[PDB]
Symmetry: C7
């Protein structure tokens, strides 16, 4: 479904935020 697939895109984008926060943690290291 198009609504389901759009929500799936939101989920993938949140994963990008998680990765970026891991990069922040790395910078502090």
């Amino acid at each position: 479904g198009e609504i389901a697939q759009a929500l799936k895109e939101i989920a993938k984008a949140l994963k990008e935020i998680a990765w970026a926060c891991k990069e922040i943690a790395q910078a502090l290291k």
Copy 2:
């Protein structure tokens, strides 16, 4: 349902963000 399952995927992704922020906290503690 596919909408419900996609919403759960959002929830799972959000937990990944929480864990990453905990890594930020740890990085600041070390």
Copy 3:
């Protein structure tokens, strides 16, 4: 309902993000 329950799972995860941000604050103190 399954949608409502999934939305509640999202609220719970957002609380986990809040708690993690509190740990960042504590780490800075």
Copy 4:
């Protein structure tokens, strides 16, 4: 409605994240 109430729970959780971020700013101020 249960969907509306669940969305309100999401709004309240986001407010907790906002408050935590204010705690971070406070921590940086001392």
Copy 5:
């Protein structure tokens, strides 16, 4: 509608997060 108004509350809560993040930025300049 109750669902639309709940979504609007989520938007308002996200703005609260943006403001808290601006406070973080202010704290770091100071």
Copy 6:
């Protein structure tokens, strides 16, 4: 639609968070 427009407001608020995070980046670079 009323629900669609509320979702657009959520998107706009998320963009505000993105800008606040860029402000954090600016403060650290300063």
Copy 7:
């Protein structure tokens, strides 16, 4: 659909936050 496209904007806005957070990470490296 208008709701689906609205959700897609939300996805794009979340990506902007991710990029902004990477700017924070880069700022910490500098």
